[PDB]
Design a binder for this molecule. Structure first.
Ligand SMILES: CC(C)C[C@H](NC(=O)[C@H](CCl)NC(=O)C[C@H](O)[C@H](Cc1ccccc1)NC(=O)[C@H](NC(=O)c1ccccn1)C(C)C)C(N)=O
Lengths: 99, 99
């Protein structure tokens, strides 16, 4: 798709057998999702850094479908105001900024 | 340009007679820049909301050049860890997400 930016670029994703919505966020290095039980191995990761850090679970090589595009990438799972698709998965789906 | 997202989408801007760098951030509703003296009228605005709010100065209808595209838009000026071009000015330059 070509997504204009008059509204927040929220897309449908499928992850861990669930449908969810997430924000395509070119300001975010990493993808951070709230409340998903993913199977397989993880390690704790400290993110943010303003006011303290937030600890999330880092799952590598997670299959995820983003606006119909089936890809693989690292997903951080933990508390986030909104589900965010970061650059790490936008590269995988071949998403570019164009003007 | 077509900008891939393997690296942070940092671009050159010209604002208030200065050259600066800023991050094209589709997760940000608004444009927030640090340390610019803009002429003309402003009003205080509270932004953020996590941990408290941050107060910035809102300047409406500011001429700004973004990666060579001369546009007009609202610029919030105050303390930010990174200069950020938000959706409000990405729409003006005709920037879309494509995949
Ligand atoms: C270092 C900490 C500030 C947090 C850390 N930050 C980052 O990764 C980067 C800056 Cl290093 N943040 C961003 O790029 C801002 C980002 O677009 C996030 C979007 C988001 C992410 C997660 C949940 C809810 C919303 N925030 C914003 O765009 C905006 N928030 C802001 O504080 C803000 C400040 C200055 C300029 C623009 N925006 C707002 C519209 C919500 C993180 N792990 O998310």
């Amino acid at each position: 798709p070509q997504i204009t930016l008059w509204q927040r670029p929220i897309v449908t994703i499928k992850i861990g057998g669930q449908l969810k919505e997430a924000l395509l966020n070119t300001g975010a290095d990493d993808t951070v999702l709230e409340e998903v039980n993913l199977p397989g191995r993880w390690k704790p990761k400290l993110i943010g850094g303003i006011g303290g850090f937030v600890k999330v679970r880092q799952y590598d090589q997670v299959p995820i479908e983003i606006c119909g595009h089936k890809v693989i990438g690292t997903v951080l799972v933990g508390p986030t105001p909104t589900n965010v698709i970061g650059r790490n998965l936008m590269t995988q789906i071949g998403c570019t900024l164009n003007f």
